[PDB]
């Protein structure tokens, strides 16, 4: 509702990275502070970030959105293709907000967009999905580099510490690499013709990017 209203803006992983960006500083003070502080244990368990669909998730999805039919169709579709959970899938679609960005990024007038088309929209949703996955690892990597340069709040339980939790990150992220390597091929769960030349490369690019940042955190 609020998201639909646009009053709230869901922080995309992309924005979260941008705030984290090495040059960035000023952005880091605000809403991000709340986000980083948030207890939600996505950081501790990265896998949960793009968890596979579950009936628990399905239930949450229904409860979460009762408000609108239309978004729902897309979210279900995307959740289906990648096999990501519905709630998360809803969030991905929810970056509907960034439509404006979408239009401008498109090519120069040799076309006056075919933006409205469902096919075009879905391709971009996949685009958004790839963007989010890649950015999330990106965020985590910078987030740690950030913390391990003096900053108490996020660390907390990590105050001039004992380093059990934090050490745990290494093995955990490490496990993720297998998945990243595994994405040699796209999920055949996805529909055909979605796989354009562009998608294939972006899919692959996501694979490398996730691996790179994951490696960086572990290092």
């Amino acid at each position: 509702m609020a998201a639909a209203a646009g009053g709230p803006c869901v922080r995309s992983s992309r924005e979260l990275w941008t705030i984290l960006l090495g040059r960035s500083a000023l952005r880091e003070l605000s809403q991000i502070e709340a986000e980083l502080n948030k207890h939600w244990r996505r950081l501790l368990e990265g896998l949960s970030y793009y968890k596979p669909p579950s009936p628990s998730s399905a239930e949450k999805v229904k409860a979460n959105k009762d408000v609108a039919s239309p978004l729902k169709e897309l979210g279900l579709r995307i959740s289906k293709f990648l096999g990501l959970d519905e709630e998360q899938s809803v969030q991905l679609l929810q970056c509907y907000l960034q439509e404006d960005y979408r239009g401008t990024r498109d090519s120069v007038k040799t076309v006056l967009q075919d933006e409205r088309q469902s096919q075009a929209l879905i391709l971009k949703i996949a685009d958004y999905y790839y963007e989010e996955r890649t950015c999330i690892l990106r965020c985590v990597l910078h987030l740690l580099t950030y913390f391990q340069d003096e900053r108490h709040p996020y660390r907390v339980e990590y105050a001039d510490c004992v380093d059990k939790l934090e050490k745990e990150l290494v093995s955990k992220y490490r496990q993720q690499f297998e998945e990243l390597y595994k994405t040699e091929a796209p999920t055949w769960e996805t529909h055909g013709n979605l796989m354009t030349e562009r998608q294939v490369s972006r899919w692959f690019v996501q694979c490398l990017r996730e691996q790179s940042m994951l490696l960086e955190i572990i290092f």
């Binding site: 803006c9 922080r11 705030i19 605000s30 809403q31 439509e99 404006d100 960005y101 239009g103």
Partner: protein, 64 residues
């Protein structure tokens, strides 16, 4: 903005209908996410010139 002030011409015609609409939205969105003071000033600055430098861009602003 600087172009418009010196230029007063129709940015909108050249920009195109859709691009202008999308752009204006960006300016509002510009203010929103990180609530930077600087970012807010920019939108105000851009819009102020647009209104003053005639109506072509201006009507678009209000209309969503």
């Amino acid at each position: 903005k600087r172009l418009a002030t010196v230029a007063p011409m129709s940015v909108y015609a050249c920009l195109g209908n859709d691009a202008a609409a999308i752009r204006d939205a960006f300016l509002t969105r510009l203010q929103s996410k990180i609530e930077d003071m600087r970012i807010k000033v920019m939108i105000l600055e851009f819009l102020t010139v647009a209104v003053e430098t005639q109506p072509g861009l201006i009507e678009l602003f209000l209309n969503l």
